[PDB]
Short mmCIF file of C-alpha atoms and ligand atoms in Angstrom, two decimals:
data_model
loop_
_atom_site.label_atom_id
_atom_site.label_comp_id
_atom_site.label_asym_id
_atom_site.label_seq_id
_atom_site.Cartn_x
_atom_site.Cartn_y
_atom_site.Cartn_z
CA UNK A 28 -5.20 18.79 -5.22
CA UNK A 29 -2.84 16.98 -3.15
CA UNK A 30 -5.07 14.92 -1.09
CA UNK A 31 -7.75 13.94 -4.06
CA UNK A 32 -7.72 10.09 -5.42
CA UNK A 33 -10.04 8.40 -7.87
CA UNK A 34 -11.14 4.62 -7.86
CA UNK A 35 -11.18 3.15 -11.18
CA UNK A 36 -12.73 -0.59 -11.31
CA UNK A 37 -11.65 -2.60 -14.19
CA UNK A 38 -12.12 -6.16 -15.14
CA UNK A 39 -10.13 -9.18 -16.72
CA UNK A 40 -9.99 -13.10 -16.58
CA UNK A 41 -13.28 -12.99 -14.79
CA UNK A 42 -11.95 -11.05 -12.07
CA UNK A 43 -12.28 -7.46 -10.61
CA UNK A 44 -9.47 -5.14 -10.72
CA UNK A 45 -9.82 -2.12 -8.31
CA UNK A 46 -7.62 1.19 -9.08
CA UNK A 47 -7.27 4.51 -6.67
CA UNK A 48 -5.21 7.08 -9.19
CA UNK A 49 -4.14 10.22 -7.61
CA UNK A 50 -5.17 12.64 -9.97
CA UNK A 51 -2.18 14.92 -9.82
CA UNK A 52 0.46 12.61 -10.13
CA UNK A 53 -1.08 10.06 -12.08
CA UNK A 54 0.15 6.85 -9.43
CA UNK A 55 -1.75 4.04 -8.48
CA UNK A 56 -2.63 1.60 -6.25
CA UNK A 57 -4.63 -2.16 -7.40
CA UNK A 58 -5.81 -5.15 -6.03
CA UNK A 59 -7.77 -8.24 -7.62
CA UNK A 60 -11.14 -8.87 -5.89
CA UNK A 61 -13.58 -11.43 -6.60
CA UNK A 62 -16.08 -8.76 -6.95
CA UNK A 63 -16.86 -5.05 -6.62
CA UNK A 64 -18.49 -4.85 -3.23
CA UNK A 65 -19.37 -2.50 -0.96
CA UNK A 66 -17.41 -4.05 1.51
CA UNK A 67 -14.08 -4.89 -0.53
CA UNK A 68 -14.12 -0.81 -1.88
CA UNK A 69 -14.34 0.36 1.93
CA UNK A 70 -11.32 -2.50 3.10
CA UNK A 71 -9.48 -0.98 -0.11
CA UNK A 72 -10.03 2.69 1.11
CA UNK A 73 -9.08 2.10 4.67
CA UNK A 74 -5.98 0.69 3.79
CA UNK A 75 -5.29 3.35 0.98
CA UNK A 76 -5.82 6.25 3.94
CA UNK A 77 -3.15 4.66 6.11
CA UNK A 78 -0.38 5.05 3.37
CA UNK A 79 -1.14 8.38 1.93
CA UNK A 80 -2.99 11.43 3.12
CA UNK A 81 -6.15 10.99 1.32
CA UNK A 82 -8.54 14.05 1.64
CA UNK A 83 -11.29 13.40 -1.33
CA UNK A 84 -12.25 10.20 -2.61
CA UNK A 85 -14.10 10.19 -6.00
CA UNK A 86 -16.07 6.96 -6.14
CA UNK A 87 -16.76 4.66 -9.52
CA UNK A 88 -19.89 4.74 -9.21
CA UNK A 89 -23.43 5.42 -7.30
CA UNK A 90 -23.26 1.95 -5.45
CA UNK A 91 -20.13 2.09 -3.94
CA UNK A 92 -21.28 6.31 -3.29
CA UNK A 93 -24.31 4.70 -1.73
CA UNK A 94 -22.83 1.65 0.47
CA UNK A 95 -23.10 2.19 3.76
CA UNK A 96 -19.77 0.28 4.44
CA UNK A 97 -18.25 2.55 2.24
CA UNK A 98 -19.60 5.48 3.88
CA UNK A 99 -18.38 3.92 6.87
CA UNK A 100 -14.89 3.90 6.36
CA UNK A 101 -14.53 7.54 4.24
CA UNK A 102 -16.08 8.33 7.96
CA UNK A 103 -13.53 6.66 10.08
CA UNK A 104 -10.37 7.10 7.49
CA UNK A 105 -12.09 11.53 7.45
CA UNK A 106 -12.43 11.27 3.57
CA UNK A 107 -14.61 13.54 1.88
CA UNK A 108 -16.64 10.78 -0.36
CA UNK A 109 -17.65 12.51 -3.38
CA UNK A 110 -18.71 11.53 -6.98
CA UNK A 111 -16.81 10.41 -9.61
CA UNK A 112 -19.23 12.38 -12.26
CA UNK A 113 -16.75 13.74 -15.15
CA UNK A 114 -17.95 17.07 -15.31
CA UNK A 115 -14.78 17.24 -16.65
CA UNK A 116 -15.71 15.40 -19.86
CA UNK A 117 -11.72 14.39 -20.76
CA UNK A 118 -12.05 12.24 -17.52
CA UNK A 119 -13.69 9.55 -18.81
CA UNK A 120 -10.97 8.98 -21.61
CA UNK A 121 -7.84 9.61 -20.00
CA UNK A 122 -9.12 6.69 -17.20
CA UNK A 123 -10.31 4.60 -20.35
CA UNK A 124 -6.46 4.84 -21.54
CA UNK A 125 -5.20 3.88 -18.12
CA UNK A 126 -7.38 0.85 -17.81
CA UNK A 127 -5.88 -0.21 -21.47
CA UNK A 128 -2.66 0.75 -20.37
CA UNK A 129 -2.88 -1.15 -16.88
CA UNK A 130 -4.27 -4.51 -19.26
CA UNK A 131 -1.26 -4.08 -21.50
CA UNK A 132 1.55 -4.47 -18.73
CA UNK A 133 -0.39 -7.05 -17.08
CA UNK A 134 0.22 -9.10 -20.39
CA UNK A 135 3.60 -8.52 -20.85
CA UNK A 136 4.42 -9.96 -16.91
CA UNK A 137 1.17 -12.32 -17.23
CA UNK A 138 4.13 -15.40 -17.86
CA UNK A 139 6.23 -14.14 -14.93
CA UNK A 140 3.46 -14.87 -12.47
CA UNK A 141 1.61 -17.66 -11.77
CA UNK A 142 -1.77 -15.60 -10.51
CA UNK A 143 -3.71 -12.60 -11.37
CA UNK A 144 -2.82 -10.83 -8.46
CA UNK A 145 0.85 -10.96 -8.73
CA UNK A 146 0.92 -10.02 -12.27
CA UNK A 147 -1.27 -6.56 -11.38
CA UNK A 148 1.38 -5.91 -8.43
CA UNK A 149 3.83 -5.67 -11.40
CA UNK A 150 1.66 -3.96 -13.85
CA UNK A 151 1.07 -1.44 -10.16
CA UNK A 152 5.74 -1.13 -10.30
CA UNK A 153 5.82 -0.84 -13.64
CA UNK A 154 3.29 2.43 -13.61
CA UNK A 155 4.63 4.29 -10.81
CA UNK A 156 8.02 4.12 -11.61
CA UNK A 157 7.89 4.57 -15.26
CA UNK A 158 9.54 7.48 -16.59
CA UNK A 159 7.89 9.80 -18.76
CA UNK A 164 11.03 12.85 -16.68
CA UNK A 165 9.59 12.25 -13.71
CA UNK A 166 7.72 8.82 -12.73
CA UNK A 167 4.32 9.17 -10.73
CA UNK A 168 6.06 7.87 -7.90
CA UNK A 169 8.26 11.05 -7.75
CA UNK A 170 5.52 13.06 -8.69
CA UNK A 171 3.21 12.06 -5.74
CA UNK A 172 5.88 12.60 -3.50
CA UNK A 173 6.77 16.08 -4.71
CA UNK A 174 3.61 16.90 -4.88
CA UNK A 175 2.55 15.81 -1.13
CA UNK A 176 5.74 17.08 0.73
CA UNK A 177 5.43 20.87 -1.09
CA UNK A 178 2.13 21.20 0.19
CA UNK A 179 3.65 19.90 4.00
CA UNK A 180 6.17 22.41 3.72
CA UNK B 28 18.67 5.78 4.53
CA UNK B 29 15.67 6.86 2.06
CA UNK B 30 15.51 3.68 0.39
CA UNK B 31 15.93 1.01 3.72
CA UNK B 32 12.89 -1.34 5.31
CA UNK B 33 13.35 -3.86 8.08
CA UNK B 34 10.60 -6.82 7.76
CA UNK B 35 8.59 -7.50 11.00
CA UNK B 36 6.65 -10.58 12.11
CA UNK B 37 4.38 -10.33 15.47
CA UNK B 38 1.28 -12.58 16.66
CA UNK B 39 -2.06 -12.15 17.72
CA UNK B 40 -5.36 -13.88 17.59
CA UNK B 41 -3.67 -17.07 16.08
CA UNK B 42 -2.96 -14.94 12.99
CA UNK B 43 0.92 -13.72 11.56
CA UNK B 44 1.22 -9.56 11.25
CA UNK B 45 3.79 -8.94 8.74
CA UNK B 46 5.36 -5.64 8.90
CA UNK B 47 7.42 -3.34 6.74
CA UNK B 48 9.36 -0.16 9.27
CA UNK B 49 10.59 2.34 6.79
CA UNK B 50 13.91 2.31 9.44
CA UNK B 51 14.14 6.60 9.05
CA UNK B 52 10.92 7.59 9.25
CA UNK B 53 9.10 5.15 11.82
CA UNK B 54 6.55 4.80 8.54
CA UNK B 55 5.15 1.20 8.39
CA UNK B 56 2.64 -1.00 6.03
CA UNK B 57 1.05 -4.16 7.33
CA UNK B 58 -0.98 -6.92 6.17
CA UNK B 59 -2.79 -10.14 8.08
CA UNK B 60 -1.20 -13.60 6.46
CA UNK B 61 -2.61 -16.80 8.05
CA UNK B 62 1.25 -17.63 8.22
CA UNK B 63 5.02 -16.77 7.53
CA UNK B 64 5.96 -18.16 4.33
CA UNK B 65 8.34 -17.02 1.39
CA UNK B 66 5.59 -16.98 -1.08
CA UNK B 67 3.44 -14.41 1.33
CA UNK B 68 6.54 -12.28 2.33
CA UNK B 69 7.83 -12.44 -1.83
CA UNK B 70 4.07 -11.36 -2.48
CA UNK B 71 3.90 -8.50 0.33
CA UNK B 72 7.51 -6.88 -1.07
CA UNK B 73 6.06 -6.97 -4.45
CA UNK B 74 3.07 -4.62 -3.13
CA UNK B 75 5.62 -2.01 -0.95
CA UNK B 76 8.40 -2.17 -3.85
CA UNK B 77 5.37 -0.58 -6.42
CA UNK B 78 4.27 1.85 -4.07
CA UNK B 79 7.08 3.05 -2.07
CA UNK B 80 11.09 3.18 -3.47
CA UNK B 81 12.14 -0.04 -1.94
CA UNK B 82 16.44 0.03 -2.32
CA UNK B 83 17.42 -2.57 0.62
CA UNK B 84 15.14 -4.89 2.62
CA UNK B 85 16.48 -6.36 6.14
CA UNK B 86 14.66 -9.80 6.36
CA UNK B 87 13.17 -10.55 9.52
CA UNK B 88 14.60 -14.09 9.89
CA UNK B 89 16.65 -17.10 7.61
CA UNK B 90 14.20 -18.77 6.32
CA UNK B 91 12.75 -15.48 4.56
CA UNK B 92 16.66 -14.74 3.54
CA UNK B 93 17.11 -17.88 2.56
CA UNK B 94 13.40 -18.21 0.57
CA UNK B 95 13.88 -18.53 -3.22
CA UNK B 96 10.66 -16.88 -4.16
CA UNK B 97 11.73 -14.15 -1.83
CA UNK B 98 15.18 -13.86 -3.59
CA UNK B 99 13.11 -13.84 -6.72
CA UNK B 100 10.60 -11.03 -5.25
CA UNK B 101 13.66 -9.20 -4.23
CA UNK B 102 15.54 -9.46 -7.95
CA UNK B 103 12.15 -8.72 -10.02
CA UNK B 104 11.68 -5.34 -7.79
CA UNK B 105 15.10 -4.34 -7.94
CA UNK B 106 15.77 -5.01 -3.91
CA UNK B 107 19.21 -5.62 -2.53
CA UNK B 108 18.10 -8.53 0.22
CA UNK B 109 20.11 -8.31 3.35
CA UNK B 110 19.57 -9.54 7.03
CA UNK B 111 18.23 -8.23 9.70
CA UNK B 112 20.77 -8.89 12.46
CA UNK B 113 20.85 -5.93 15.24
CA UNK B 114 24.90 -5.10 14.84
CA UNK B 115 23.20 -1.94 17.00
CA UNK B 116 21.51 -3.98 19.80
CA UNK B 117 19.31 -1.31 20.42
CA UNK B 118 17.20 -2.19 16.98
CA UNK B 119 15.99 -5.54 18.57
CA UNK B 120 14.02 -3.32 21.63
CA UNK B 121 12.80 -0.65 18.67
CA UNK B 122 11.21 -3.66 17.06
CA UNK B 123 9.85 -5.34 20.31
CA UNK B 124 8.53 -1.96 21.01
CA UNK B 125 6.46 -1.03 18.08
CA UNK B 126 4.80 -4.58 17.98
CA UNK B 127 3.59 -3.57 21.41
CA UNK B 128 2.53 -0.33 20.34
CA UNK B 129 0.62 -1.91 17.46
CA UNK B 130 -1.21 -4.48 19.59
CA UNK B 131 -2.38 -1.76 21.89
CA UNK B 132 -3.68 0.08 18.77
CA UNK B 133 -5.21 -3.24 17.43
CA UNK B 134 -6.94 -3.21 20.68
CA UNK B 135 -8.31 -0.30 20.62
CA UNK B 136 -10.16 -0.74 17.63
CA UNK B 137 -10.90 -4.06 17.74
CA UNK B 138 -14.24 -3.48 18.86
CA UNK B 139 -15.06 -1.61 15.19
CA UNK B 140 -14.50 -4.07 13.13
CA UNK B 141 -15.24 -8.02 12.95
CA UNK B 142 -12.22 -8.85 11.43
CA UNK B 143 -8.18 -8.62 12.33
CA UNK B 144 -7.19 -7.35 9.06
CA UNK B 145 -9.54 -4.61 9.32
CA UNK B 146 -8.21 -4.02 12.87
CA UNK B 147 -4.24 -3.92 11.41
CA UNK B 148 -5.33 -1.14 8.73
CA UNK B 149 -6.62 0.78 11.42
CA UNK B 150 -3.65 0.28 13.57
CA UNK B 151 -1.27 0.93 10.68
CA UNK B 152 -3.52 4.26 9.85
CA UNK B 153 -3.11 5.50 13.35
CA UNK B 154 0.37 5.16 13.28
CA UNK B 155 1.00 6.30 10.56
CA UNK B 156 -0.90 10.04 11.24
CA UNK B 157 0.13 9.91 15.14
CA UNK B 158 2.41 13.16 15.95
CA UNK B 159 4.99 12.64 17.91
CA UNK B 164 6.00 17.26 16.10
CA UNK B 165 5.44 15.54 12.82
CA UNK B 166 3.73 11.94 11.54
CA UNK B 167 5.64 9.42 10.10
CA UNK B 168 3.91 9.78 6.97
CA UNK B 169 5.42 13.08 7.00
CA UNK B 170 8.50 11.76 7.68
CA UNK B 171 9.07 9.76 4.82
CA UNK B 172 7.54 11.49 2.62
CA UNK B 173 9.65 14.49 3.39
CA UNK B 174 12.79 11.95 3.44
CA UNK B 175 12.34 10.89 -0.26
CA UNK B 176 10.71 14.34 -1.54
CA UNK B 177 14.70 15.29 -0.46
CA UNK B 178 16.53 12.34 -1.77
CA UNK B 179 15.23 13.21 -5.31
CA UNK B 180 16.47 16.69 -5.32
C1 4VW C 201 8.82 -12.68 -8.25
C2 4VW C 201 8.24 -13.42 -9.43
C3 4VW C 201 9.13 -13.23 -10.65
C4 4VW C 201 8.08 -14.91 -9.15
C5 4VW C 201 7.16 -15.24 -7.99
C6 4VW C 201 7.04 -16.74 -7.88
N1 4VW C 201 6.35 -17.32 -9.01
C7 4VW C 201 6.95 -18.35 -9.71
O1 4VW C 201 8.01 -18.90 -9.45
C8 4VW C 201 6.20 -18.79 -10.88
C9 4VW C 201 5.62 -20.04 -10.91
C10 4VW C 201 4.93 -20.42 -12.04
C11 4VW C 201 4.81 -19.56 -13.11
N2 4VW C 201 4.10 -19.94 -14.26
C12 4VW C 201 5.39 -18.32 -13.06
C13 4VW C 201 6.09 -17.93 -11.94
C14 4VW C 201 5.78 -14.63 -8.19
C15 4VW C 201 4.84 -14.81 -7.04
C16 4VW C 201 5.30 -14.41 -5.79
C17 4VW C 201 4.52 -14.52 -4.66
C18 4VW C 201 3.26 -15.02 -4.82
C19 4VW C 201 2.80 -15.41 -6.04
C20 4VW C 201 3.56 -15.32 -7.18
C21 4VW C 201 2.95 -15.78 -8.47
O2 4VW C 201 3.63 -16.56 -9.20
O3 4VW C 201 1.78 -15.38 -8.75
O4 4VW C 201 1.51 -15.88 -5.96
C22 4VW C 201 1.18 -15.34 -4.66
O5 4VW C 201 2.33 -15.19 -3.82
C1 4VW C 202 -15.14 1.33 8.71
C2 4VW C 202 -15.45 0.58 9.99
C3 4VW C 202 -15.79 1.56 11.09
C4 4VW C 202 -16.61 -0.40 9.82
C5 4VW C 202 -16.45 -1.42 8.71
C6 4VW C 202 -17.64 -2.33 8.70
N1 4VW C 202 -17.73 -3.10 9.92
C7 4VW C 202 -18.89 -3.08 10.65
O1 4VW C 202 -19.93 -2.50 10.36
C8 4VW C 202 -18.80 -3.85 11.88
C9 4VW C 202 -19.48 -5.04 12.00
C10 4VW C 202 -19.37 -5.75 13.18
C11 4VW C 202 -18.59 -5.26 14.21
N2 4VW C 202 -18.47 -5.98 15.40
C12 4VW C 202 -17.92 -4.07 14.06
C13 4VW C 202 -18.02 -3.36 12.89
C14 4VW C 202 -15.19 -2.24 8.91
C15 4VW C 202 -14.90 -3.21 7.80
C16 4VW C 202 -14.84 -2.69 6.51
C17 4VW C 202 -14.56 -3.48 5.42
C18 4VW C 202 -14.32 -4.80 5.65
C19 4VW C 202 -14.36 -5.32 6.91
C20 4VW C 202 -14.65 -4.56 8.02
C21 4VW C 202 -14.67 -5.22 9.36
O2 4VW C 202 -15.66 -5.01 10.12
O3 4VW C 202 -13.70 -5.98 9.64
O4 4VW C 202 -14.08 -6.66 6.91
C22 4VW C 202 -13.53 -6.75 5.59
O5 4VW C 202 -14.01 -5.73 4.70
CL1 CL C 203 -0.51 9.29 5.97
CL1 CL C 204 8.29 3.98 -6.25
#
């Protein structure tokens, strides 16, 4: 439970928004990309596994499963690369909901920034410490240093 | 202490390292910039201030102090922006000695991947997980787990 993260790729203005949600706390991590690539989902993995403790990786979908860059780094970060299927057929929904509420912030800062990637930085703050009362930035934490101790 | 970060800036390759030391745990992000500017250090404490619980930020020089989109960065995430002078001279050879820790790491790796940014996320995974008996990603995570009890 602890160590499992999902990637989430979303788009707007023409650009690619990739998401990792930890699944038990509900916090995320973005960045813009020109595109979903192979290559950009591995970078975006290796540099997730150096800030948390990230055990299982459900992909978006069967490319970036496939890529052999991504297989690559889930390798060298030791992440178990699994699927993303939602056997679990709520899944689908409650990362639907996330993507609309991710969109939503974004608008509300989209005048604060000047580009894209700033404005999903702030939509990224605004997530993980909203209160809702614990944010998902205490929750992650909580969650992570119980299973430590 | 749970909430402080010194800034770093180091060399290599003709590239800038920026660093972020969370200054109780020995827990540090990192990111490739092609140079030190406000706008890139503003833009890199947006990303930690989402993901970790950013309080007080020592700058790593003036110019960053003095940068207006870094003061701006530093109001929007709720930062209180200080300096980064060593009143405990011991905190300049801490610094000096991690950036030649991290080089040797970079190093180390260099050889599996092409690129220097890949390199850093390696370097900044390694350290990160290193024992030393725990991580640093332990560390802090244990550090804040605490602070919000
Ligand atoms: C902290 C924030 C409230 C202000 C920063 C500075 N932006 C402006 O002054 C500005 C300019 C024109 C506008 N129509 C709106 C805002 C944002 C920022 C920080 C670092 C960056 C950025 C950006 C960005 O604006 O995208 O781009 C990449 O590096
Ligand atoms: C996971 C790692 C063991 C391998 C990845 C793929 N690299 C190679 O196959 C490779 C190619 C030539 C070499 N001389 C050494 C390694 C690294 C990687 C992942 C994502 C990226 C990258 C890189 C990068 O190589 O910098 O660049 C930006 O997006
Ligand atoms: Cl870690
Ligand atoms: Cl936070």
């Amino acid at each position: 439970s602890p160590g499992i993260w999902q990637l989430d790729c979303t788009h707007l203005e023409g650009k690619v928004i990739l998401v990792a949600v930890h699944v038990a706390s509900g916090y995320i991590e973005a960045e813009v990309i020109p595109a979903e690539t192979g290559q950009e989902t591995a970078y975006f993995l290796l540099k997730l596994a150096g800030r948390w403790p990230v055990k299982t990786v459900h992909t978006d979908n069967g490319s970036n499963f496939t890529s052999t860059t991504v297989k690559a780094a889930c390798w060298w970060a030791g992440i178990k690369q699994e699927d993303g299927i939602p056997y679990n057929p709520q899944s689908q929904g409650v990362i639907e909901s996330m993507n609309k509420e991710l969109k939503k912030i974004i608008g509300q800062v989209r005048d604060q920034a000047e580009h894209l990637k700033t404005a999903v930085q702030m939509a990224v703050f605004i997530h993980n410490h909203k209160r809702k009362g614990y944010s998902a930035g205490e929750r992650i934490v909580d969650i992570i240093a119980t299973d430590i101790q």
